[PDB]
Subunit: 110 residues, 2 copies
């Protein structure tokens, strides 16, 4: 099932990177254009960024400009971040595993 799981993870990463896009943009808009930060916040109450293609589709009806920036920002975030994710996540898995195996072997040898 490494196909079913790869696919589901990629969809999850795609949507998560989109949330990170909207988090970053909203942070800039806090200083740069506060009334749009606020708007972005309320629209996100009314639309679960979880279902991200629908969110963006919902947003084009009201703010095409913000939709475009999320598209752009998330493409850059992906392009920036994705290359280190393999090495990072695997390394964190090997060391979380390491900790947990060191801890329970400690309990097993009381």
């Amino acid at each position: 099932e490494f196909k079913k799981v790869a696919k589901e993870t990629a969809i999850t990463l795609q949507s998560y990177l989109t949330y990170q896009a909207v988090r970053l943009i909203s942070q800039q808009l806090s200083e740069t254009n506060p009334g749009q930060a606020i708007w972005l916040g309320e629209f996100s109450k009314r639309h679960p960024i979880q279902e991200s293609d629908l969110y963006l589709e919902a947003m084009m009806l009201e703010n095409k400009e913000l939709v475009l920036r999320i598209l752009t920002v998330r493409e850059n975030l992906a392009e920036g971040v994705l290359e280190f994710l393999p090495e990072m996540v695997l390394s964190q898995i090997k060391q979380s595993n390491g900790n947990h195996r060191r801890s329970l072997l400690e309990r097993l040898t009381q």
Copy 2:
């Protein structure tokens, strides 16, 4: 902020791959050992797999064997899946972006 975002994404991927581990294991246990599938389900009600190092720490107090299998299965899942994630997620971002840009350019040129 590509560091703050890479770090947060890796933590999220780590935890998500752990949930996928527990999803897969629970699926096997459905057929292989049903009474442990059920137990795994109830423990997951009482412990948010979201905070995954704590979950696994909570589980060692009650089922060290299952904790070890999650450790193993999630390391394999990571090792299996992580190499295609860059190419996959970026490709899905380029084509989701493509769709949304094709759709709103359609509205802008009514």
